[PDB]
């Protein structure tokens, strides 16, 4: 369950968006200084406090109980755009049943006169566009000229979104999840498919330059603020470690259960899966740049279509493309459906824990599933429009993988270390795990993760650069404002809860602070 679209889809395009080589240095810096400490942190908070989500910050500093509300906002927005990823994957899966895949050859209705098939491009020398980018942008995306031009609601993307939301409704509380078929399927089938796509990509001609672009850093790119924050929020994204999902996972664990080796195994496996998927996709992109005669950084989308360009293009250069296209997009749907089952189950669980007996279990709980799925549908219908990828990129940069993740991780590490105490928390960990954490975890919660999150947060503001889609489209200022509103809807869940809890507690400021930072 640490394998998913955040590994096989998000880390490749975030690496491609940030120059490839220079993305990995803040990636590993955040993975070691920040990401695995916060992973162990929320798993321990979910294990210590027997509940999770909001009411786990009741025996851990009740003043900062807004971390749960921040996680609820984050998981709602993540549910919306992560299910529209699944809608794109379903649209590709239904288009995979053709013998000749529509992104393989050049003569269709959506293709421009500037089309050329990929193997023919090196013979002709330059304003010539590959069929994978053409199929993506003008059949799947049906991409408009901006977010201020939404175009029209594209049909059958809404039907793919309806299919994946009906599968989510019929498998979360009207049904069950995978229990006995987890062996040899849905746990190693994505790893097998990643192995197949990796051994395809590494044996491709010209794929050495793609690995060179992937691994060798650009030191001048490390001074960009976007690289550090993209790497940090990619670590916090693929771990889902500002989400409440891992806190809810720790609630379904025993008290004296060893959850250190499990956490570092899951985190290192997740980051290694991301690294292997990056190897695969960037080898495919090196092959693509070799074939098309264009630069490696300009061969495909510098946005969230890289897994929908590089992987389908490698499926075309594979024996029997139809079979592997069907298996690959069923794999994408299985990864994203498992992660969406986990996150919608966590959102539903923490929302009915937020209001007990306002939603009774049984008849009215089932109505609440339909209500929340319908609301996330109507918020997801602005992403299957013509200009729906711009809304999606706004969500992916801002809603659940931006300064909100840095804010929640910094506030969790700060609350634990400097209000709850690293020594008191280590005493709790010793009582549960068996040993108190070493100086790595202690000084990461105390120094390294607050310093990294605060430094990248201020570095993304002093040298502010606007969000750009595919390196060419500058976003409008109202779109940046809407994305910042999406970020601040999670970010302001902490100080609004602080102000509310200070207002609802009587006494002077010192007495209120003392009552609300002493645990219950």
């Amino acid at each position, epitope marked *: 369950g640490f394998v998913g679209l955040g590994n096989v889809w998000r880390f490749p395009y975030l690496c491609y968006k940030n120059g490839g080589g220079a993305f990995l240095i803040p990636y590993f810096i955040f993975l070691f200084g920040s990401g695995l400490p916060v992973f162990f942190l929320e798993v321990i908070i979910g294990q210590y406090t027997s509940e999770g989500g909001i009411t786990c910050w009741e025996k851990i500093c009740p003043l900062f109980s807004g971390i749960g509300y921040a996680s609820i906002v984050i998981v709602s927005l993540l549910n919306v755009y992560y299910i529209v990823i699944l809608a794109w994957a379903t649209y590709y899966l239904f288009h995979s049943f053709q013998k000749d895949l529509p992104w393989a050859h050049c003569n269709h209705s959506w293709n421009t006169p500037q089309c050329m098939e990929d193997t023919l491009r090196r013979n002709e020398s330059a304003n010539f566009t590959s069929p994978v980018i053409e199929f993506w942008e003008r059949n799947v995306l049906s991409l408009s000229s901006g977010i201020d031009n939404p175009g029209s609601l594209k049909w059958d993307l809404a039907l793919c979104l309806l299919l994946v939301w009906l599968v989510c409704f019929f498998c979360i509380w009207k049904g069950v999840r995978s229990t006995g078929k987890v062996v040899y399927f849905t746990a190693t089938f994505p790893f097998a498919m990643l192995l197949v796509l990796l051994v395809r990509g590494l044996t491709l001609p010209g794929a050495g330059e793609g690995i060179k672009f992937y691994l060798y850093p650009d030191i001048s790119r490390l001074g960009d603020p976007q690289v550090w924050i993209d790497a940090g929020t990619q670590i916090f994204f693929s771990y889902a470690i500002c989400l409440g999902a891992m806190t809810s996972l720790g609630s379904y664990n025993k008290y*004296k259960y*060893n959850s250190y080796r499990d956490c570092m195994l899951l985190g290192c496996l997740n980051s290694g899966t991301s690294f292997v998927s990056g190897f695969a996709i960037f080898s495919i992109l090196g092959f693509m740049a070799q074939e098309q005669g264009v630069d490696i950084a300009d061969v495909a989308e510098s946005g969230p279509g890289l897994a929908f360009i590089a992987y389908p293009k490698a499926v075309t250069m594979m024996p029997l493309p139809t079979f592997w296209s069907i298996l690959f997009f069923i794999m994408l749907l299985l990864l994203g459906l498992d992660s969406q089952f986990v996150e919608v189950e966590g959102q539903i669980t923490s929302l009915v824990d937020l209001y007990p007996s306002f939603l009774r279990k049984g008849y009215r709980r089932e109505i609440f599933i339909a209500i929340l799925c319908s609301i996330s549908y109507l918020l997801g219908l602005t992403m299957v429009t013509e200009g729906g990828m711009y809304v999606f990129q706004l969500f992916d940069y801002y809603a659940a993988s931006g300064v909100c993740l840095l804010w929640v991780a910094f506030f969790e590490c700060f609350v634990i270390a400097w209000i709850y105490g690293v*020594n*008191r928390f*280590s*005493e709790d960990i*010793r*009582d549960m795990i*068996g*040993y*108190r954490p070493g100086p790595w975890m202690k000084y990461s919660w105390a120094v390294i993760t607050p310093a990294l999150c605060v430094g990248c947060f201020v570095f993304s503001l002093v040298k502010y650069v606007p969000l750009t889609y595919n390196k060419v489209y500058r976003y409008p200022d109202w779109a940046i404002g809407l994305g910042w509103g999406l970020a601040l809807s999670s970010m302001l869940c902490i100080p609004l809860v602080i102000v509310i809890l200070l207002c609802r507690t009587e006494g002077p400021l010192r007495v209120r602070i003392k009552y609300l930072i002493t645990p219950r």
Partner: antibody, heavy 118, light 108 residues
């Protein structure tokens, strides 16, 4: 060098009280959980009580679960063991044992103070 | 309680002989939490083997430990005159922490 020095060893009446005092040195006392282990005169080791590093999580054996009280002094590095309702079958040889990692066990033990019931 | 029934206390073995001693537990110990202590005659116990295999500081390499779950074993490759003491096995996972019985190694 880790040194655990015990005190308070003496003869007490049944149903009485005694103050044991494990004075530790050579290590930070606030970061290691400490335990009292007694040894019966027929040489049978028995863990009595464990206190955590901060003094918050306190565990007791089934024999002494309601009449023994273990506490620390993290400022001056002394572990205590208060006693009351001390029955006849409590004459033993009491060691203070430093066990913080549950997978390392009691790596450092103390010196010997004898409790005698008569 | 997790009663650790250990090998009988009175074992008499000549020096230089490979010896072993068992430690059966009533419950199941997680095999990273069972430790062995060597208490000499009239002296305090000291940590000898921790996490059922690793060797404590000042312990020679001739001692070794094995076993998991229920049955746990301490093994001496060759016995010398400084190995004449009582060995207690000790789970330290379950919160009523229990030591084993005696296993006193006397000479011949």
């Amino acid at each position: 060098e880790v040194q655990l020095v015990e005190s308070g060893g003496g003869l007490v009446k049944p149903g009485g009280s005694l103050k044991l005092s494990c004075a530790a040195s050579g290590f930070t006392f606030s970061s290691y959980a400490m335990s009292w282990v007694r040894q019966s005169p027929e040489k049978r080791l028995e863990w009595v009580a464990e206190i955590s590093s901060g003094g918050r999580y306190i565990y007791y054996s089934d024999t002494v679960t309601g009449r023994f009280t273990i506490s620390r002094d993290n400022a001056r590095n002394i572990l205590h063991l208060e006693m009351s309702s001390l029955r006849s079958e409590d004459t033993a040889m009491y060691y203070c044992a430093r066990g913080e990692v549950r997978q390392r066990g009691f790596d450092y033990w103390g010196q010997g103070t004898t409790l005698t019931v008569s | 309680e997790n009663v650790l029934t250990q090998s009988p206390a009175i074992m008499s073995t000549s020096p230089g002989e490979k010896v072993t001693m068992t430690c059966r537990a009533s419950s199941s110990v997680g095999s990273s939490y069972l430790h062995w202590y060597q208490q000499k005659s009239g002296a305090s116990p000291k940590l000898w083997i921790y996490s059922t295999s690793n060797l404590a500081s000042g312990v020679p390499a001739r001692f070794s430990g094995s076993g998991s779950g229920t049955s746990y074993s301490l093994t001496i490759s060759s016995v010398e005159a400084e190995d004449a003491a009582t060995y207690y096995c000790q789970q330290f996972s379950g919160y009523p922490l229990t030591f084993g019985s005696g296993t006193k190694l006397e000479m011949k």
